[PDB]
Design a protein around this ligand. Structure first.
Ligand code: SAH
Ligand code: SAH
Ligand code: NA
Lengths: 265, 265
């Protein structure tokens, strides 16, 4: 009868909400995609075991090109669920699928889950101080994306923090590390030379948020750029002007150099 | 010897994650605060029942002034949980509590849950397009705050959406409605004459995010200012220029006027 978009959360199958779990358990058919983000390798088997249903995993093409041919037809006479990493509508184009559902006469409901977008709170940076967000995309052949560099500049000018989602090419098992993101940014700085991202820029890295032991590190690019932050997924953040307590947390919790405790108001 | 910061999610007792619930159940002591926000879709009783643990509620003062003498002492020799609406560490001052834990020789871990920061994705507005966030505060006595108006201006100016949290008096259970927020913004507009918020401004209202049947409405202030958006909580969003896909979602899913497809894109 209906279609449920259910988020699985940040890191593993236990990041699903009780609400999402109880609803998924009652669905006739269950689909999912694992290309918009990276979760624990054992999330599928465990979530299948958790909801007690066989789950059909869909590729980006299956969804973007054939969602209304593979999933919607079933949601016409059965309760169907579509599982996704984190929150289904954050930094994805899945919201458009609700429009496809409506046009096919299918009612849809959304069950949220922990998202990397709000998990940034664990970095100690005030979430209301984040400005426009951006994605550091892998260059492709002669194509070298750079717009994310301009986002940092725009936010920095306003004293706002910049959240940088990192690229992912699931079919190729490619998950961009904060290290790779920093290298690309230094390359763009070389071209544009705007003094936006350099070896002296303070950055914050959050790896495997949602796990009980995520890696939270803050420091200068020259120091962080070759540091091991553990397995992906990773996000990179370029803070703007820091409040005293933000710097204090970065130093006490994220191991930032005590030098940042001193803020130039 | 361990303190767990656990989010309860958006609206009711089922918005906690499986991870959060299982951990809370194994804690010797469980504390909670409902001053940053209130779980309007449930009660303390229903949450206690789900967790199967007595829950000691803490006031703003208990937390802000005495966290280290109320919560931390017990965490030194037992597993303790601190429950908060939404996602932990989203509230501006909560991150600092982890510093207090460290200073007390107490380890702390964070269990995430859905936050309105990410749940607003259900409005169809791209998360990356959101800029700085603000809170609409009730004017009091001789104090007439207006910074939230300047935030909208700075974001909209750069084509970014503005997430506006509405004033709440948890203790008195007083919630500012989207309707009241709009009236206030018009009053502020009449004072600053910035051409930022008028009867012709397109806004989005999201009420009861997290529930299976949230109220999602989009339209011009002149039309929505007296519309019934249902029971709180309400969040107001003033989007910047829309991507055609965002506009289509608002029209098809949020009942927005066809007009936005030409006027606000
Ligand atoms: N647990 C996690 N830890 C660190 N970064 C994460 C993460 N989950 C997602 N990301 C970041 O976000 C990118 C996916 S973007 C999709 C996000 C998802 N809808 C959500 O709500 O979280 C990843 O490539 C990575 O840069
Ligand atoms: N379910 C919900 N729907 C709409 N707005 C909500 C909401 N829950 C909280 N808010 C908004 O946010 C304000 C409290 S801010 C506290 C938010 C919390 N830490 C989180 O992570 O979500 C409220 O006054 C209200 O305007
Ligand atoms: Na934001």
């Amino acid at each position: 009868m209906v279609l449920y978009f259910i988020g699985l959360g940040l890191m593993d199958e236990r990041d699903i909400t009780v609400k999402g779990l109880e609803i998924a358990k009652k669905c006739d058919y269950v689909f999912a995609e694992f290309y918009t983000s990276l979760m624990a390798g054992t999330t599928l088997g465990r979530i299948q075991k958790l909801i007690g249903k066989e789950i059909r995993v869909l590729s980006r093409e299956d969804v973007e090109l054939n969602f209304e041919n593979i999933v919607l037809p079933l949601a016409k006479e059965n309760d169907v669920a579509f599982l996704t990493p984190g929150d289904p509508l954050v930094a994805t184009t899945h919201a458009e699928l609700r429009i496809r559902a409506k046009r096919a006469g299918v009612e849809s409901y959304v069950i949220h889950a922990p998202s990397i977008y709000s998990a940034v709170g664990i970095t100690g940076l005030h979430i209301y101080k984040f400005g426009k967000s951006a994605t550091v995309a892998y260059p492709e052949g002669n194509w070298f994306p750079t717009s994310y560099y301009d986002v940092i500049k725009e936010n920095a000018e306003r004293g706002l923090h910049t959240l940088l989602f990192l690229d992912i090419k699931a079919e190729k098992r490619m998950y961009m590390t904060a290290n790779e993101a920093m290298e690309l940014l230094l390359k763009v700085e070389d071209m544009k030379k705007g003094g936006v991202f350099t070896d002296d820029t303070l950055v914050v890295v959050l790896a495997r948020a949602g796990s009980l032991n995520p890696t939270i590190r803050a420091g200068y690019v020259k120091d962080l750029i070759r540091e091991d932050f553990g397995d992906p997924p990773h996000i990179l953040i370029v803070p703007g002007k820091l409040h005293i307590v933000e710097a204090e947390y970065l130093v006490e919790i994220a191991g930032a150099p005590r030098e940042i405790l001193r803020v130039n108001v």
